[PDB]
Design a binder for this molecule. Structure first.
Ligand SMILES: OCC1=C[C@H](Oc2cc(F)cc(F)c2)[C@H](O)[C@@H](O)[C@H]1O
Ligand SMILES: [Mg+2]
Ligand SMILES: [Mg+2]
Length: 531
């Protein structure tokens, strides 16, 4: 018990243990408030038209760890009372929020929120989108059902409230419950590999690919992954451009060289210029009967597939079936937020319901022995489907000392999110902190900075992928990788998770180098490691 617990409300009514029933004009919910280890759990079921359903109300803390819904968005500590709404880029509206009306008035946090000594968190997002808002000094938890009606009962997304001095332990515990609730996939083996993006970007040639393929026999890579560059257009994934061969021919060549073939797609996205859009314009999410722009990128309007339509799911099954048959066993599936944009779909289901039919179709198509890696993705809804997940914005071959914490490529902000989302590793999935850039030339990263990034990711036990012209990686670059791989295998903890000054103390236990600690400063770019 406590004064602060007595101040809480659940579904409109002062907090206490028990079973309850709430009959309102347009919906009904039945819920239980049960005791669990380190606090409380609210669970139940709902029917009718719940709209934006208020679950919990409590006093807003002064400092809160907030979390954006998707890969690239910040997880960071923020002063709650001195919040001002950001201006929202109309090209990137839905990477900031799936409920942008909230963000333009109030501080928002998706899926969970933390303070010193306390965590509030939902265990799932299967039907509704669970978020928090700070409204006039109160913290308020909602489930958004996006105007769907339910004739029969469906389960609530469960909420837990946990209390203990050790906040790191609360987050690790929250994540364990999330893991159990969603049948998380956590492979016993972690892949190493190579990725084209962070050297060649959109200008990768097959000539350059063949060159790197040969050099990679001298590096400890299992996987060889082609990124954005090969494809004809966004949506036309089985047609290549430039000097590239067929998609089947690439897979066959990578395999012969002794590597697991990997390939990038953005599978819920189709451009205004693509073949598949012009063939099948009715396959996309709509506004007033017209195609609704999901985002703008590659200097084109990009639309979202309507994953409520059988035609669309059949098309996805056939695509990823074909890729599997060719020999691809590693799939980076990107810009997935597109699949969950609000709007008009064929069937009257939520965007989250549609997202989940989408990603389940992909897993079905590629099978169980394929490794899926999420990117640009809603986090909670993906748990149990993906094997790995990018948990930060894009890294870069420069620190970004003078770049703002929005979502623009920068090493500093990419590593920040790997630290503040550490607790998802080995519970939701394998965390992907984005690629190591270890080349000596064609870069602005200092040796110090390269050491900071790589050793931190090794301590955290995160996926280790390099992205370089392997010609430009010599003695220092090879040594940094070898040592980073030595740092894997432990159980990590960020001890000062609520810090506001970009300095962190991080421990890991049972690494291949025993027990270690690293102290890192992301502002000054300094580190201190003990083995
Ligand atoms: O377009 C390819 C691509 C896109 C994504 O990165 C960005 C996504 C953006 F919206 C803007 C940007 F400058 C970079 C992925 O995180 C990155 O890893 C790469 O695969
Ligand atoms: Mg009250
Ligand atoms: Mg591990």
């Amino acid at each position: 018990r406590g004064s602060h617990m007595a101040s809480m409300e659940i579904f409109g009514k002062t907090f206490r243990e028990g079973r309850f029933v709430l009959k309102e004009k347009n919906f009904t919910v039945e819920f239980a408030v049960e005791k669990i280890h380190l606090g409380w759990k609210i669970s139940g079921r709902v029917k009718g038209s719940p709209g934006r359903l208020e679950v919990l109300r409590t006093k807003a803390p002064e400092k809160v760890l907030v979390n954006n819904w998707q890969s690239w968005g910040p997880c960071r500590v923020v002063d709650a009372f001195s919040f001002k709404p950001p201006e929202i880029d109309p090209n990137w509206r839905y990477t900031a929020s799936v409920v942008p009306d909230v963000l333009e008035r109030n501080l928002q946090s998706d899926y969970f929120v933390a303070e010193e000594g306390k965590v509030y968190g939902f265990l799932s997002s299967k039907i509704a989108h669970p978020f928090f808002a700070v409204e006039d000094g109160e913290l308020v938890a909602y489930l958004e059902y996006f105007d769907v009606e339910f004739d029969d009962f469906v389960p609530l997304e469960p909420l837990v409230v946990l209390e203990d001095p050790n906040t790191p332990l609360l987050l690790e515990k929250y994540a364990e419950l999330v893991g159990m609730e969603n049948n998380a996939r956590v492979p016993k083996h972690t892949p190493t590999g190579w990725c084209s993006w962070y050297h060649y970007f959109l200008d990768l040639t097959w000539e350059e690919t063949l060159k790197n393929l040969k050099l990679a026999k001298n590096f400890p890579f299992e996987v060889f992954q082609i990124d954005d560059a090969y494809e004809k257009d966004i949506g036309d994934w089985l047609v290549t451009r430039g000097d590239f061969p067929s998609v089947e021919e690439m897979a066959k060549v990578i395999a012969e060289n002794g590597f697991i073939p990997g390939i990038w797609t953005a599978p819920f996205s189709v451009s205004e210029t693509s073949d598949v859009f012009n063939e099948h314009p009715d396959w996309v999410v709509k506004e007033n009967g017209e195609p609704k722009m999901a985002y703008r990128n590659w200097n084109k309007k990009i639309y979202a597939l309507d994953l409520s339509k059988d035609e669309v799911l059949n098309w996805l099954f056939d695509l990823f079936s074909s890729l599997r048959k060719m020999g691809y066993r590693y799939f980076k599936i990107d810009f997935l937020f597109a699949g969950a944009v609000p709007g008009e779909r064929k069937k009257n289901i939520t965007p989250i319901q549609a997202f989940r039919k989408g990603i389940e179709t992909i897993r079905k198509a590629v099978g169980e022995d394929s490794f899926i890696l999420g990117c640009g993705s809603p986090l909670l809804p993906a748990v149990g489907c993906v094997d790995g997940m990018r948990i930060g914005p894009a890294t870069a071959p420069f620190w970004g000392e003078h770049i703002e914490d929005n979502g623009a490529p920068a090493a500093r902000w990419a590593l920040r999110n790997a630290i503040t989302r550490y607790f998802m590793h080995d519970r939701f999935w394998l965390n992907d902190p984005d690629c190591l850039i270890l080349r000596e030339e064609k870069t602005d990263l200092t040796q110090k900075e390269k050491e900071l990034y790589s050793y931190t990711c090794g301590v955290l036990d995160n996926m280790i992928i390099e992205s370089d012209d392997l010609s430009l990686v010599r003695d220092h670059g090879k040594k940094v990788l070898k040592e980073t791989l030595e740092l894997l295998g432990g159980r990590p903890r960020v001890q000062n998770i609520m810090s506001e000054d970009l300095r962190y103390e991080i421990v890991s236990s049972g690494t291949l180098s025993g027990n270690v600690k690293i102290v890192v400063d992301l502002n000054s770019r300094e580190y201190h490691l003990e083995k």
